[model samples]
Target: ASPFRLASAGEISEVQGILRTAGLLGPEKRIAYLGVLDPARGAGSEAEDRRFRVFIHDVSGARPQEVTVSVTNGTVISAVELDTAATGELPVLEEEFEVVEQLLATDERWLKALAARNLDVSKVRVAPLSAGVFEYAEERGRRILRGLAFVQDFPEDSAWAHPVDGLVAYVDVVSKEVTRVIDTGVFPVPAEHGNYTDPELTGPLRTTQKPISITQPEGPSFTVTGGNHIEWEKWSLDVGFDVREGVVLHNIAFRDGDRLRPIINRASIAEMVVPYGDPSPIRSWQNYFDTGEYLVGQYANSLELGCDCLGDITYLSPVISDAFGNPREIRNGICMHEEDWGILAKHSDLWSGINYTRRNRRMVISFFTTIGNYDYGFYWYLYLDGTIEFEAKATGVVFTSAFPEGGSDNISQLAPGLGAPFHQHIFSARLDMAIDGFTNRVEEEDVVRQTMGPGNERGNAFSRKRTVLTRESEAVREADARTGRTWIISNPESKNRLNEPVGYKLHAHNQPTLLADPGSSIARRAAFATKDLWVTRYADDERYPTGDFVNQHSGGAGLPSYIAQDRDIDGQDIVVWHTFGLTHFPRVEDWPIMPVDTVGFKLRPEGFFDRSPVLDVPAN
Candidate 1:
């Protein structure tokens, strides 16, 4: 129970034990950080002056199911309230669909009693990011094939979610047709073999076909990308406190670059494409092969499951280019040594679905989500011209993950295979795509098409469930399943001569020379320009840091220092700022004027934004 016992890493358990021993569920306390600096200043500008926004999010399991925050340039922008499907909106639909509404119309007693019924939908002003905790139950449906005339009840499934699948149930509410039902994991595949790398099939390809067992708990939802331009003047940077309660009175402030961009972007951070598995269950060297970069990046900032790269670009394979020379696969997820912090691929939740767009001399970003977690809000980055911008959003306010009585749950179960008890913990992934812009590239219905072509081929192709390639000829080989696929590379050295194997490999690494085409995708171009070039770049870059506490290797340290430098942000002389990484539950003392996320970044006055440009106007 000593305060000093709360200091060490192993002391985490002791702290939690103490809280439980004290009989305090979660000691709700008034938290404050007076010295936190504003890191939002423009690049190359030494604007050390600062302000703070009241950032009030709680870590309690009993945090509000729905939160309403008012925003409108210091004026009250009508408070908006949101609810979870478990308690708030879904019940309304349940009652509406209880019996036939047609029968209810004739019941005069039902109509006169509830004539002024209210069905609120302000909660559905969709955003760009979300995390779902999901589950499901199997059901049955019918579909007639090309030649088969009779209706067959195929296995369909009913989803049992954490809160409830309110968003979907609500969609059914508007279009009340109990006609079509689709199965999730047990989808059937055709007899013919074909491509399994289609984007449309990507979701189904990796996901198992069963009643979707998702943990879709409702919480905060928001947009991580998409806007015209970002400007600071339109932003408010101020902080005040409630002297009586020791809490911030008016803690709202302007969103800064580093803090603003990453926290919002974190919602949509995607892992690289996977063949057929949960991205987080990656605990092997093979998992790090093609999509390893993404796995490492998406899990980088989480409490558990963060990774430093092999620090060798040679370890990566360059993405194969389509006919138009556009990359078919993402080569890198983390920009370890690079200046651009762009993610290698897109992820989805419920709000900000990820997508890329080239606007007038600027880039526009977007994302989406379904289930809820943190805050049901949207954050926008208004780009002014190409170099300047502003950010804002509406998100679900969350309860607390940190316990006050002091508990081990307050700390995230960092990383997989850490010899820790919580090995199954995964930092959930969601999709982020632009709603209005790039979303049009694929129509809603059109998307379900690719699942037929490529997906059907791959999933069913593996009847035996595992692959075993025998070295026949470099150009041809025999799989253990007796398949007649060509052996792409029988030679390991010649395997990556051209590039890394992306999408699909023509052959395995140790195939024969004559049978393998040096020009084949995986064996042709170098994934890295040179293994040395990649190693040097990763080692020299400053974005990634190596610290003693970080695992360094996935299993544990002592493997190799993928990251060379090990210095905390302390002496970078560039003041380390507080972004939204910290989690705190809102208390009764936090009512009236809610806190704004006091988030910002520091500019070293060196290389400013992409280029010097006036950010006085919005980028729309």
Candidate 2:
């Protein structure tokens, strides 16, 4: 049974006792007191308080997820599965149908309504393209006539438009190009591609004839051994290879050399291929947040191996830089606010009172530039306060497909075997304030609901979502391996943050080890390497996870780009090796339009501080 603890003072001995009693640290287990937060000044209704909210993410092996815990009672506050199987047992179709009716009456999507703001210039507009009957024929088969729906905008462009629907699909008659765009609106690309649909992709998907690899056999390697610090040159390396054919060559150098190089850890590489986000087919992965963290791990793991790399593991350090000069950083625990001393003064006394006064720890700040449809910028900072804040003063939601549940419903990207549950992640946010002052840190485990859902519609932490679209191109896939028929991709003219004038110089690396690689390899690499089955929930059927999306990298040959002529698709070039995870969203017993609802977590300040504490000195 889990225990609970109440902090009497900042006494080390007492804290240890509380931890031991709470089953957090055992007498035998070597446990260290990492740090404590005290945001209160005195004790009383008027006094500030300090609180603690702990979130546990189990990414140890294959099973990963976020567990919410209460520091006060030391109880399992909430057990949210970032990725779990859904029986598709919704409340009822009538419930959602009414929601849809109400939403349509309001003339806005769920998010738009929730935000309580009207967007005209940056609106998520949808237009039905040609729905005419077209003829499709196979090389040796007779022509078949069928009705088709085409999307015009890219799914990735949703970031700017924030359309009611996150995805877009359209069929082009002149080029006969059917496309569907996916926006990384909520979750990262890594999470988006975290499952498996094809088994043959367990290997490389490209040949050695890629121009980028041909020029430089060994791509890039880290020459220095450093701490948790990484700084790289400005767009120093640029290469395009086949994601599919060059699997073996992808790891040759890293494996043969040090084998465990520090420069490449649990990193992510996102290519700017076709445009993403346009609000047609509802392409964003925001729907995946419901299954919980484990599903997210499965989703990412599946994609890692499928893209011609290794297994479904997020290394200690991650890489997020691609060949096209776009760089990004992954800061786990940090906070960021404007660099205004005056504005920060109000909270200075509280922050300084805690042990925070002694530690001269400096916050880490990184920059990233997105270039796509509309040029924009963002500044990101991560402070020791355990906050990952993004100052998005730059450019930057909801439902096209309506059903009975409410109106607009989304499904997970995992394979259909998982029963097409509602997209685990939907765009949602929550803020919790414990009537008490900062003394009672906002409980990270708090369940603060938003707009619509059961149980106050609270948001859950550890939610995993993905954008169906991006600024550059629509994320809609013309054809999925399961369907065997191509769909239309919308939003071809989104925006690219990294393509902008100036962005952060992204750096990537892995934990240094004796087996680390130091040299390049002789074999040619695939566009993306395919390795193992990146399972999410121990590869258990009960989990029913989905695979990831594999797209042609703009840096690779033959893959087409929006701004220029289609690149050559030399067989030797890299190709995408995708591993689609859970794809089974069990059809709802009562089908109709579902309600417009999203899932997320509530972050309250109760967990960060003590309701009442002994006040002391203040420091900056």
Candidate 3:
């Protein structure tokens, strides 16, 4: 009965009727809809209830008036007026070419802008811009479509590397006219011949290999319940999708024999930022809060079998709304499959020469979101060894900017006129852990080199120091490799056989904190990325780490503000935010498209279990 229930065909038809009865639906005042979301936060109900938060816009006025409608039990119950601001939705894929055509037909400056690069107007390739241009469009109060100009080299589809630098154009989406053009400065177009699909250079570049197969003789080792709920061996979790936060896992639990234990209530990517190193007007203002500015879940790529995912896979389709608030289903948006993860453990008895070995199988739930120039692949892996790994794979075209020949040595030169600037892709996940129970505590465990005290004369000694965090403010920590720092979430009352508190440890690697100065605008806007970890008491409304309205936002309302009260988190139902990502310095090989660069962290059972949890498994 939670209002977050999916609207059925009947409910959709009824809502239209309800709007008609209420005189809110008509030809002169039609609903320019954005899709439905959940009003679960302020519903004031612990009991399961059905509801949907639907958005509608009255198109009668010069500017559309935004409205929010709450539907319960297939009937419209409440309607309220929201801010009359434009919501960021990806431009229709087919509209990019139409935008270019309209710009050339209506605007005299567009032809001149194209001629400035000495390229024919017809051959110009326009890729829509969302990160920097959309920010400006929102402030201008115009439905503007911004695009980067590139020239096609080949006959059909192979003209991405050939960029016409320094030129960017803005088109009035509503007016169908070119509004403005801006140039940063001339730059060299290095290696314009670096085509990805040039048949002439198809030597070792093209992969002409046979497909590798993974077969399960007895069918898949995992079972999916009601499509999205997955149960694999000891793992059980529900996968849900949101328009803002792509794939979210809920009610995650693990079974130990007859006893099932709750590990996490929910987990999702809270926010991510790709900040460029250059300080130019265009590039400097190009810090992207991918989750906040552009909805990552709205752009989830429909996965292909035997390509995006392997083996026996189960796909789930979720209903999502477009920028105009129209509801539609994205098919195969989420995929779940089981994979072989090498050997779980292997040992041999020297006296009898008897070897003990078991192969490990892991269930992986994954989804990919294409946010502007980059495609981020997220995977949640549940291994038999009581380890859950959250991985992010960044693979796409780098957001290239115009740079002159012999420009700054800091950024990598792609073409004569194009430079892919040095940048960082910072990602963070909000982990609402419920290890055993809701009342949990966090403790930082650090490995330190012990000095000779009274007992030992030798110096080379190492020991682990555990520090319990008593308040929310005290839990914000950074990754220190030298100290071998890690965080543990545990319940004090639940003890293992060794009298150690039952807990799970969070381990991260190559986690890069935000390198921008803390006082800088970019850093202040994305302050959540400044620290590797944050712990706060559970609050339903504090969902987005970079705040709810991040497009054209200056700063302040995100994680920094949420925890400013420093409320007590000790022995309370808490949420842990883990931040980790890559500090990418582009190379020449990254031109055309980039290879997959992965960064991630893991949650493993520390003293949570009495013994090796998988010891009962038979050797394969």
Number of the top lDDT candidate: 3
Error of 2 at 573 (Å): 38
Model 2, stretches more than 4 Å misplaced?
Answer: 1-364, 376-379, 391-393, 396-547, 550-620
lDDT for position 440 in model 2: 12
Tens-place lDDT digits, model 1, residues 464-499 = 121222211110112221242211111111112244
lDDT for every model? Answer: 0.19, 0.21, 0.72
| Top TM-score hit | 3
What would you estimate as the lDDT of candidate 1?
0.19
In model 3, the Cα lDDT at residue 476 comes to 83
Off by over 4 Å in 3: 1-47, 54-72, 77-80, 84-105, 131-146, 153-155, 169-180, 188-194, 204-210, 323-326, 351-353, 415-417
Per-residue C-alpha lDDT of model 2 across residues 386-495, encoded as one tens digit per residue: 22222222121112232213222333222111112231111111111111111111000112224545654554433322222121122212212222221111111221
> TM-score order of candidates, best first?
3, 2, 1
- Encode model 3's per-residue lDDT on 1-620: one tens digit a residue: 32333344444455566566665555544343334444443436665434444444333334333344444444556665544343333223323436655565345676676666566777776766543423453346554456666666657644456666666666655556677777765544444565566666444663677778887778887786665667888888878777677888887899977888989988889888888777665456567667766668778999999899888888887766543334567889888888888999899999999989998878898899897568999999999988988999999887675555567754677766667778999998999989998889899999978778766577667789998888877878888887889999998878888998899999989467888877777787788889998998888668777766565455666788878879888888889999898998887778778899999999999988988989988874
- For all predictions, the C-alpha RMSD in Å is 28.6, 28.4, 3.9
Clashes of each: 130, 248, 20
TM-scores, all candidates, are 0.19, 0.21, 0.88
